[PDB]
Every structure is written in C-alpha cells, then in structure tokens.
Amino acid sequence: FSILIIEDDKEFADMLTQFLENLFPYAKIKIAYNPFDAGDLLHTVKPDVVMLDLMMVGMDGFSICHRIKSTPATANIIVIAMTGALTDDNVSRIVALGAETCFGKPLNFTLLEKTIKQLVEQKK
C-alpha cells in the first residue's frame, strides 16, 4: 500500500510522513518536494493515496488534481487536498475536481486519522 505526499515544506512533509508511517506500519510513504518530482513520482511510486498541498510553489494543485482524477491510469487514486488559507471557493473547486476533501492548515490530525482510514477501507 503506497502513499505519495506532495509538499514543499520539509519539516511538515517529514511530520506528515511520520504520522502516516505510525498509522500504517506496512505502507510505503514517499515525498515529492517539488513539482517535477510530483509528476515523476506519480508514476514511479504508483500511489494509492496522494496528499496534495495546493500551495506548492510553481505548480497548480487544482490542475494536478484534475489530471490525476480524469486520467484512466490514475483515476482511482484517493486524493486528499491540503491548503493554508481554506476558503469555500477553494474547497468547492478542489472537491469538484476529484479530491475527497480538503484540509486546512494547521492540519487537524484527529480528523485526518479517521478520514484516511475510512477512505482506504471504502475503496476495498
């Protein structure tokens, strides 16, 4: 079981990674720290879940989400958006583009714990 984290904040990316390794001791968790690595690791890691930061510098997260969810090979990936300033327009947009949901920052890790476990199960 495989998770790809798209996130340019290193400290946060390592914390999210550690949290998700704690939660799923048998998953492989990978980080893409920049837009190219995000494009590349989409294919090479073959993730079941992507955690998508919508404020990564130099990439349009809305477009990336749309590309993931509308392409046959990647359509079944569970996409969870994350962003700093949540507005309801950004949430509505990301969700309509195929993300399951969108988390504001600082991330509510209690809600995330429940959410990601649910989504992983409701796929199987």
Domain ranges of the chain: 1-124
Closest to 20 in 3D by CA, of 65, 96, 82: 82
- The token pair at 9 is 């904040």
Q: For residue 3, what are the β-bridge partners?
A: 29, 49
Closest to 90 in 3D by CA, of 16, 76, 82: 82
DSSP SS3 for 5? strand
What CA–CA distance (Å, rounded) separates 65 from 74? 10
Determination technique used: X-ray
Contact 43, 17 (CB under 8 A): no
Three-state SS sequence of 45-92: CCCCEEEEECCCCCCCHHHHHHHHHCCCCCCCCEEEEEECCCCHHHHH
Longest dimension (CA), the chain: 36
> Using DSSP, how many helices (H) and how many strands (E) does the chain show?
5, 5
Given the structure tokens 């195929």, which residue do they identify?
98
CATH number of 1-124: 3.40.50.2300
Residue at 119: amino acid letter: L
What CA–CA distance (Å, rounded) separates 91 from 74? 21
Residue 25 CB neighbour total at 10 angstroms: 6
What CA–CA distance (Å, rounded) separates 116 from 80? 8
Residues 6+ apart with CB under 8 A from 94: 54, 61, 62, 65, 81, 83, 102
Residue at 54: amino acid letter: L
Closest to 69 in 3D by CA, of 45, 46, 43, 100: 100
Which residues does the chain break after (C to N > 2.5 Å)? none
